[PDB]
Amino acid sequence: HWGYGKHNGPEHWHKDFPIAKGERQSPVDIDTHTAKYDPSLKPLSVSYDQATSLRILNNGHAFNVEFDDSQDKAVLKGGPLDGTYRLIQFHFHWGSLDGQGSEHTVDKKKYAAELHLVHWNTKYGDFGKAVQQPDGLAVLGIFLKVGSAKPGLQKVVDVLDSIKTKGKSADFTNFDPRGLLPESLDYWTYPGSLTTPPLLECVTWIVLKEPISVSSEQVLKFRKLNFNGEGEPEELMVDNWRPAQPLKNRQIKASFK
Ligand SMILES: NS(=O)(=O)c1nnc(NC(=O)[C@]23C[C@H]4C[C@H](C[C@H](C4)C2)C3)s1
Ligand SMILES: [Zn+2]
């Protein structure tokens, strides 16, 4: 089944998931000179003060930190969004090398990794219904570069030893996702898709202009994870990113100049 290897990687996904060649696929290259400033875009509202993290899980393609999304505890609104979107999970995509790993690119530049905070539109009642709607999800994307350590990421890094292999989970309570945000909330936005199968076209992408910096040691610990389950041959979880897809009939908008 699908993955990031030579025989099941992004170039193969379209066989099981024909929408891979669809009209609003993600990620994309963000051409900063062609992105249109949109003065009517509202400031993002990130309200994570009441966030309740529950668990961290190695799902065989990345690790997800999951949140309680049965009430409005951590929500995203404003920006290009109408209504309220609840945080359900975050995860990362990263490379085998610092020069690659992000899914979105900026003027063709790849970052070392990319964080996705996934939210769903509460008007649809649950995440399963939301992914079937064109405005069902809002994903906040944040680039990572290697430099100084990100203090707020360290609790994540330190639990990875306990979820090395596919299917492993660990209690992960009281984690504050605010510690992963850059200083500025300036963003680009466009309509797109999930970047992993089923590749559903249900996402309003909000990609922050300002990367966070993480340390060499922090990203190295990401790369010690495994795609495989325990007792299966070891394959390091690296390069779990989908490359840029055709923009087609879409305009990327900027919240800033
Ligand atoms: N890379 S990306 O952000 O476009 C995404 N690509 N796929 C995502 N899938 C989900 O978010 C899931 C959310 C919760 C329910 C479903 C099962 C777990 C827990 C995963 C799907 S995000
Ligand atoms: Zn993702």
Residue with tokens 């190695």: 58
Structure tokens at 125: 């009642």
Question: CA-CA distance, 53 to 30, in Å (whole number)?
Answer: 31
Cα(118) to centroid(ligand 2), Å? 8
Structure tokens at 24: 């609003």
Question: CA-CA distance, 94 to 99, in Å (whole number)?
Answer: 10
Cα(38) to centroid(ligand 2), Å? 26
Closest CA to 145 of 218, 211, 62, 222: 211
Instruction: Supply the Cα-derived Rg of the chain in whole angstroms.
Output: 17
Is the CB of 137 inside a 6 Å radius of any atom of ligand 1? no
Question: CA-CA distance, 51 to 167, in Å (whole number)?
Answer: 24
Is the CB of 116 inside a 6 Å radius of any atom of ligand 1? yes
Burial of 241: CB neighbours in 10 Å, binned 0-12, 13-18, 19+: buried
Cα(43) to centroid(ligand 1), Å? 25
- From residue 182, alpha-carbon distances to 106, 142, 247 in Å are 17, 8, 26
Is the CB of 115 inside a 6 Å radius of any atom of ligand 1? no
- Binding-site residues: 91, 93, 116, 195-196
Method: X-ray
Is the CB of 199 inside a 6 Å radius of any atom of ligand 1? no
Give the residue extent of every domain in the chain. Answer: 1-257
Superfamily of domain 1-257: Alpha carbonic anhydrase (3.10.200.10)
Q: Which of 4, 59, 63, 88 to mutate to test the pocket of ligand 1 (most atoms within 8 A of CB)?
A: 88
Closest CA to 82 of 129, 28, 30, 138: 138
DSSP string over 84-114: -EEEEEEEEEE-SSTT---SSEETTBPPSEE
